[PDB]
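Researcher: Next entry: apolipoprotein E (Homo sapiens).
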Amino acid sequence: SWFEPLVEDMQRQWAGLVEKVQAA
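Model: Predicted structure:
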């Protein structure tokens, strides 16, 4: 329900993490 916009900021930093792990 909530955290509508908080998710998007989570995408900024956490998506950078997603690339690091995918590669190894």
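Model: Note for the record: The chain has one helix and no strands.
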